[PDB]
Scaffold this active site. Structure first.
Site, mmCIF file in Angstrom:
data_model
loop_
_atom_site.group_PDB
_atom_site.id
_atom_site.type_symbol
_atom_site.label_atom_id
_atom_site.label_comp_id
_atom_site.label_asym_id
_atom_site.label_seq_id
_atom_site.Cartn_x
_atom_site.Cartn_y
_atom_site.Cartn_z
ATOM 1 N N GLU A 20 -68.067 58.996 -2.075
ATOM 2 C CA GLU A 20 -68.748 57.716 -2.229
ATOM 3 C C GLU A 20 -68.392 56.804 -1.063
ATOM 4 O OE1 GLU A 20 -67.650 55.599 -5.756
ATOM 5 O OE2 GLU A 20 -68.810 53.824 -5.193
ATOM 6 N N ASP A 94 -65.153 56.601 -6.961
ATOM 7 C CA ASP A 94 -64.187 55.520 -7.066
ATOM 8 C C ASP A 94 -63.750 55.339 -8.522
ATOM 9 O OD1 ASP A 94 -62.609 53.310 -6.490
ATOM 10 O OD2 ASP A 94 -64.064 52.522 -5.043
ATOM 11 N N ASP A 96 -63.794 52.585 -10.532
ATOM 12 C CA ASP A 96 -64.337 51.366 -11.118
ATOM 13 C C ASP A 96 -65.640 51.708 -11.838
ATOM 14 O OD1 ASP A 96 -65.829 51.911 -8.877
ATOM 15 O OD2 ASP A 96 -65.212 50.124 -7.768
ATOM 16 N N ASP A 98 -68.815 51.026 -11.167
ATOM 17 C CA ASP A 98 -69.891 51.550 -10.331
ATOM 18 C C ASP A 98 -69.688 53.032 -10.041
ATOM 19 O OD1 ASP A 98 -71.070 48.914 -10.089
ATOM 20 O OD2 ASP A 98 -69.457 48.451 -8.679
HETATM 21 MG MG LIG Z 1 -65.865 49.345 -5.950
#
Ligand SMILES: [Mg+2]
Ligand SMILES: COc1c(NC(=O)c2ccc(NC(=O)c3ccc(NC(=O)[C@H](CC#N)NC(=O)c4ccc(NC(=O)/C(C)=C/c5ccc(O)cc5)cc4)cc3)c(OC)c2O)ccc(C(=O)O)c1O
Ligand SMILES: [Mg+2]
Lengths: 402, 517, 517, 402
Positions: A20, A94, A96, A98
């Site tokens: 990402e 990641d 988080d 998103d």
């Molecule tokens: Mg982020």
DNA sequence: GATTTTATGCCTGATTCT
DNA sequence: AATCACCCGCACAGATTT
DNA sequence: AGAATCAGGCATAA
DNA sequence: AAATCTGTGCGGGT
């Protein structure tokens, strides 16, 4: 197409990564083992194949590049899982919200368009760390908040911590640590249900004795308990609060209706207590913990801390002071994303073949998975809204009390 | 390697994302009508001291400060959020005063960060009034290093006047603007009578009031929206036909357009429609707006009637639009559909809480200052023994101990010290050991230090009298604060006075017109 | 539409641009060897409090501060200027301490402003020493709102130590680096004898000293450059031929390279050359440079001879380069060509001026403090009449007039003033009317105000004795400052002490080796 | 690309602007009369055609786009100025040194490659403002710095300012305005001779009486004169420097000079007030101002600003107080570049036909222009260096100073 | 988060003319 | 210096199929 | 055979 | 000739 191909030509010992962002992709290219590892950065969020028509899927650049990288065909009369490359596939998004959204999109694509790859078990999910701890020499990485809390509690009682109550007790490890762990568990139990009651009432009920329902009576007995609780609550305040009470009877039990007020001209008018609350297991465990947690400290009390001694009451401040002592010379960092980590950290934390941690994706049932995918990723708002409402915080308000 | 079923992973990840977006990005807070990004941007600008009557600051300064300190997301979103709040054609009452190129009503563009400047607006200081007196709660930031307010102590009804628009997972929200004076009148009417009905409230609040001053064509959807929280209305442009006689010419002039509509797109769409023969009777189209007003000129053929072509334009092009009213907001961290009365009641409750907390803080400050003044006034009446004691002692600490050791007689200041209402002007944390005992005063350590910090200049008469005047004023202030805390009827008077002052300062006239079909 | 001739426009425009570039962009100052951008960057970093023993700051913050306050130009130029000062392989003594990715010797480039951090270096504090004591002049910024120093009160010979390179309109400049210890020895030698020749100076300063530590070939160019101001020198790389017997096949190992040479371009150039049969006797090429140091390995053919192939690489490849020394700098705001003695003399004169101005400032401060201390002592000598007079004061102004308008008895302190006589400590601006006249002190207005601003805490013994101790030491300080200002030898002794201390603190060893042809 | 064309087709009513920078061009595109105006942004600096070859001139992209836009030919046997689009051409560069450099490059291109266009008068230069000032109601743009000084002075003496000498006279404007203008002119003259004499000496000489060299001769009053001047200089000294005097009688008229030892530890040998200085007109006008600027202020005096008052005893104090009072409710904006202006300001200041201002470029002599262009823009360094040195500060010492 | 080609002076080596 | 191609819910023309 | 011409690299600016 | 289907834009996020 931003693809950094590997050297090994055998399609049974190669690997592929779907990184990402661009900085993370560059760092992964920097720190990879170039022999048998490949990289494919993703710039942003990708198409939702559940909603899009088949015609628009072939036009999109991201899915086209992914299909070209995999090497298999797409669509009926062209798909051929036998002619496969990169038998290992890793997501590594990641840590988080998103990242989790992107993960769901990729899983939807893989399940809907290439079921056999998921069925045969060629899809993996990586797990990078979040926290980094340093103490000069001893440094390490910690994943998730719960492990960080456990590490903090363990460091709080890493040797020493001999609590001398009156003359010379010595808990000496197991007793103190087990008591602290049970106290933390009870604090978590209080915090999960903190919405429906004030913190002061719950935090004071543990110090109060059991209700003693046996001797309860309409007069001369119902008032004493509630008045004692209110008096104990009133004399410990710093926000200009006030605790008052009233009681009543309904021919079965003598019930309480305490009231509190703070920084408001309004009034709750009730915090009712009856047979239901005492019958609950939460109050039982609270009283069980409070039996051990009493005013055991005498006129003289202290803890045999390392070259330190802080004789005071109100053991919560002593716990905070011990935590400060543990945190006196400790360094903590909280990573923000994959971009922050340097290539060496990325190599040694996730891409190392002999120290990494991953998860393998498997399919248990077909019809349930199909229904869940259709409900969550479909283009009908009402089932999705109903599903979100059902599993909201109300479903999290589990009254098991354990 | 540890196995995991796909269903559990999908469910956990999607629920996490959805629940974070619902209460983290999109929906506003009912009490002040601000999303988290707006609140963080305004707080960051407040901390920098970027007031409304000082020099401007670059946009990059504020954006970098916000991203580094409070908001860990991309910078394009932050800059777009800042730019939207400074445009006169987007917000009814702008919250930012900008300088540079911030775009036009044609939806052209905005320059980059390095070519623009911004500062706070005057009305934006009303939202953050009395922020330093412990009126709201603070929470940790994304890594436990800073503190952010939980909600602003607003003084304006921001949610109704400015409106809102947001998209989330499973729901959305869309609320239009309103006029400030009408909303303040409605709030006052509610305060005077809690059992007021919706029909009574609609006497003071006829309907929305958009910045662009269009015409609202209908009156039946407003009632449904205000009574249930969902409705639909039609917004129509302002246009007419004028005849110059001579050769019987007809022309159509367009002055005002609906809300959230681009003029360039409208003009090019009309040009496309006339080119495709889908609209008949139009000769030429021109735009002549320059610095004073809006004008779009349309010429009609000599063998056509203006009314028919105008109605065809209303039916086909974007000169009339629909607006779907749908009110959704966060009450206690939970989404909820609301109507007018709920919003007004929430605003009133917020004001009550803020005023109570402010009063408590002020009372504490006044009591502490009076406590210091008592010691200074008592010390000034025994000069000779005090100077003897200080001179004999070799060190300040010994003099402090000598001062604290023995009691001091009140002297000629006994009239005012015992004139207070027993313990009205006494700090709550002071023990009964100290204070005005039976005819003697007992000094604490900090009072002794304050005595030792005294200058010679205070020995003059004028400086001596000013302290006594201050003490009497403090007693009066303490009495007033206690009276405010006492009864439940003074608080409403204070709130009414504040609302009336706000109306007098920031009021203005109506723009949009409301008509039947 | 007024006309204008093309010739006048061309002449005025080009002359304006040329003069601004000549005296504002490209050439350095002989006194401290800094361009305006460097001086502004260092001053801005100093004002923010970004010292060498504190936490880092982001590059974007400092760049924005410099752009907004002092330097009206773009961001890329300022950031590249900051980046070049933090590279160990560019400056002999780095002036900025950076954390991030600031490039590498191999040929990489630095990251963006959003990904790096910086602070001041320890040596950079020596350039800005004694900046607050009015040692240099100040000038306005572009918009006439701030002040910037005209020249730094430098203490390091920056120009010779770090060199320079710049391209102006009509001229250019190029000066190499040197070693600090040798330059300090040369300065001390010049201070000892002021008629020393160039041969006398070259005993202590053999030649340049680059950071990359190559070899210098020849010696005539250095003498020519130091004597006239223009010269040429040859820089050669360090390489050797190694063989371990056994098979009898030798290899060429390269450890170092010339100044300002890219390693990757050198390797690819050698590959291209050997590809086309232009260099004979080379079999393989490899780079083993990592962490420990630089090592480039060239494996020759079995029948090759090491010396024969090696001698061709210097003539063909970029392992040998030519550096053209050309010294140009601004003396009094105009360009000029210098030699070594002129630079050393300019530095010495700058040091003399700075020390003189600093001494004057310190003397003024000491006298000003002693003036108030005398009044405080006299006031404490007569405390009881003073308080008795003050107590009968309707207002402070009347008390001040009463204090001023009468003589006062010295008391038991007059003996101390026997040491303080002889007009050693009296301020210059003070008139003969005030002060001690006939054993009766006369007060001024400011002394009366200082008396009125006296705290009771200073009535104890320790606070009374500290004043006398401070006065006694201030007298000796004044005496030493006057003695320094009274003669010329003491000034040179002070300068020698400072230079020796700098040499002890910041000295280091030599890197480049000089050899004959 | 990078060309916003107009709708007019007749090549006798069109215009073309060559804006510096991309943001300025973007702003200019919005705020323009779209019927008959076009834009062509320039990103940075352009090629020098004097030093370049024809092949590299045709290879570059900016000059190629300009040549295509203009519509004429290029080079000999193809160039034809009759086929010219955009009969009006405007430059409109920024107001700093780099803007003037770009202007010189563009003029060089036009004159070297298209002499007929310049000779026929189809090239113009635009003059945007620098400052903007607002005073609540009044608003206006100000060009350069001299106009700002004029505006500040006019605002300072805007109404009231009735200077009272003793009890209540009234200079009332015009006389005070003449005195202010004379003082400003004399100060401007004084500032441009700090190199040859100290500032303090020149400032002090105005208040002392005229020397009257006609009656001086050898009366030995020059000693008392220089003693008085040195005592006055040493009176208000505040930087540690010291002053002395010396005299001698080399000729019939005695000569004298002061000596100063200054902060830098160096001593300047003398600043002799010899025949050249005393006979010069600069000293004559200094004395002329001094005669009207003797002790006109009496024991009691004040400056009567509008509905305000302040007692003063010097002219500089009165002027400074007036200037500081005039800047109370004033707001100023300074444009660092063309990109700081919104489209409406650009329209009303540079692009409006009925309120703009421009200059027309014309040729006076041909051989002189060719020689100057070859000297400045050629690729021979030494003539250019000699030319710059000729007009350097050595020739800047203009003895007129009027 | 990544996004062009110019001005300005002195010096090298590589390539083209007579 | 402003621009890249998608995610989320609601309302509405213009276009294809029954 | 040897002059004359053409490119590219170094540090602050659009 | 009524009924599905396909696009477009509004405001904060990769
Ligand atoms: Mg982020
Ligand atoms: C010189 O400037 C100034 C200033 N300036 C400052 O003081 C100043 C100070 C600080 C700063 N900055 C910071 O502190 C700063 C800046 C950035 C960060 N971010 C991060 O670390 C992290 C990364 C990590 N870990 N990022 C993100 O999470 C991140 C999130 C989203 C994205 N987005 C995507 O990928 C997209 C859009 C994809 C897509 C997909 C598909 C597609 O087709 C298109 C796109 C990208 C990154 C952190 C700190 C600064 O910058 C603003 C300043 O300017 C002051 C004064 C003046 C003056 O003149 O007075 C002046 O001029
Ligand atoms: Mg500029």
């Amino acid at each position: 197409g931003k693809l950094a191909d590997c050297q090994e030509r055998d399609p049974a010992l190669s690997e592929l990564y779907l990184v990402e962002g661009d900085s993370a992709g560059g760092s992964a290219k920097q720190g990879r083992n170039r022999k048998n590892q490949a990289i494919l950065p993703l710039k942003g969020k990708i198409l939702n194949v559940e909603k899009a028509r088949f015609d628009k899927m072939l036009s999109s650049q991201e899915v086209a590049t992914l299909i070209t990288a995999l090497g298999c065909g797409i669509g009926r009369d062209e798909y051929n899982p036998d002619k496969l490359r990169y038998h290992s596939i890793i997501i590594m998004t990641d840590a988080d919200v998103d990242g989790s959204h992107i993960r769901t999109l990729l899983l939807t694509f893989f399940y809907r368009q290439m079921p056999e790859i998921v069925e045969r078990g060629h899809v993996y999910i990586a797990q990078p760390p979040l926290y980094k701890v340093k103490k000069g020499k001893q440094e390490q990485y910690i994943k998730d908040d719960e492990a960080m809390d456990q590490y903090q509690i363990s460091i709080a009682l890493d040797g020493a911590t001999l609590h001398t109550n009156a003359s010379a007790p010595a808990l000496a490890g197991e007793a103190l640590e087990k008591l602290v762990s049970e106290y933390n568990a009870t604090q978590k139990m209080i915090n999960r249900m903190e919405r429906r009651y004030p913190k002061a009432m719950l935090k004071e009920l543990i110090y109060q004795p059991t209700l003693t329902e046996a001797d309860l009576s309409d007069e001369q007995t119902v008032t004493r308990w509630v008045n004692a609780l209110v008096s104990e609550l009133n004399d410990k305040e710093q926000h200009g609060s006030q605790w008052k009470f009233d009681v009543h009877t309904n021919a079965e039990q003598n019930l309480f209706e305490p009231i509190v007020r703070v920084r408001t001209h309004g009034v709750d008018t009730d915090y009712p207590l009856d047979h239901e609350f005492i019958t609950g297991g939460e109050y039982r465990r609270i009283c069980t913990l409070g039996e051990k947690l009493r005013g055991l400290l005498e006129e003289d009390a202290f803890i045999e801390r390392g070259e330190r001694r802080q004789p005071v009451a109100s053991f919560e401040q002593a716990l905070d002071w011990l935590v400060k002592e543990s945190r006196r010379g400790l360094s903590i960092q909280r990573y923000k994303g994959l971009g922050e980590m340097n290539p060496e950290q990325l190599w040694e934390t996730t891409m190392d073949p002999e120290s990494r941690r991953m998860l393998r994706v498997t399919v248990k049932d077909a019809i349930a998975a199909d229904q869940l995918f259709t409900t969550l990723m479909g283009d009908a708002v009402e089932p999705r809204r109903a599903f979100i409402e059902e599993n909201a915080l109300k479903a999290a308000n589990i009254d098991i009390e354990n | 390697i540890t196995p995991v079923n796909i269903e559990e992973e999908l469910k956990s990840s999607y629920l996490d994302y959805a629940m974070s977006v619902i209460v983290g990005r999109a929906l506003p807070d009912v009490r002040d009508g601000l999303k988290p990004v707006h609140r963080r941007v305004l707080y960051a600008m407040n901390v920098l001291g970027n007031d409304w009557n000082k020099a401007y600051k670059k946009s990059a300064r504020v954006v970098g400060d916000v991203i580094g300190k409070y908001h860990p997301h991309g910078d394009s979103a932050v800059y777009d959020t800042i730019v939207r709040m400074a445009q006169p054609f987007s917000l009814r009452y702008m919250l930012v005063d900008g300088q540079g190129n911030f775009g036009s009503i044609d939806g052209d563009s905005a320059a980059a960060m390095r070519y623009t400047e911004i500062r706070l607006a005057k009305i934006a200081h009303e939202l953050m009034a009395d922020l330093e007196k412990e009126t709201v709660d603070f929470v940790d930031n994304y890594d436990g290093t800073e503190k952010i307010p939980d909600v602003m102590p607003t003084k304006i009804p921001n949610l109704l006047v400015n409106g809102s628009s947001g998209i989330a997972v499973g729901m959305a929200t869309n609320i239009p603007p309103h006029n400030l004076t009408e909303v303040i009148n409605g709030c006052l009417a509610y305060i005077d009578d809690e059992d007021i009905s919706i029909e009574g409230l609609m006497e003071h609040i006829p309907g929305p009031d958009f910045p662009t001053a269009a015409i609202i064509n209908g009156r039946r959807g407003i009632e449904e929206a205000y009574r249930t929280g969902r409705g639909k209305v039609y917004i129509r442009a302002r246009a007419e036909v004028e005849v110059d006689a001579k050769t019987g010419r007809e022309t159509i002039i367009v002055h005002e357009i609906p809300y959230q509509v681009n003029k360039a797109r409208l003009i090019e769409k009309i040009a496309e429609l006339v080119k495709e023969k889908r609209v008949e009777g139009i000769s030429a189209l021109r735009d002549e707006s320059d610095k004073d007003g809006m004008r779009i000129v349309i010429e009609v053929k000599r063998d056509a009637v203006g009314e028919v072509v105008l109605n065809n334009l209303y039916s086909q092009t974007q000169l009339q639009v629909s607006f779907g009213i749908n009110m959704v907001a966060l009450h206690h961290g939970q989404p909820k559909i609301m109507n007018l009365k709920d919003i007004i009641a929430a605003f009133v409750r917020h004001r009550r809480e803020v005023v109570t907390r402010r009063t408590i803080f002020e009372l504490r400050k006044a009591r502490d200052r009076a406590h210091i003044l008592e010691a200074l006034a008592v010390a000034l009446a025994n000069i000779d023994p005090i100077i003897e004691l200080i001179r004999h002692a070799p060190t300040p600490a010994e003099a402090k101990t000598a001062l604290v050791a023995n009691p001091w007689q009140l002297g000629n200041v006994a009239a005012m010290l015992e004139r207070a209402g027993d313990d009205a002007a006494r700090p709550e944390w002071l023990e009964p050991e100290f204070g005005v005992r039976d005819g003697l005063y007992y000094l604490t350590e900090q009072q002794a230090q304050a005595i030792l910090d005294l200058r010679l200049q205070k020995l003059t008469g004028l400086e001596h009298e000013k302290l006594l005047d201050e003490y009497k004023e403090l007693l009066d202030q303490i009495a007033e604060l206690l009276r405010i805390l006492g009864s439940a009827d003074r608080l409403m008077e204070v709130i009414r006075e504040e609302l009336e002052l706000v109306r007098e300062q920031f009021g203005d006239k109506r723009r949009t017109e409301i008509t039947a079909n």
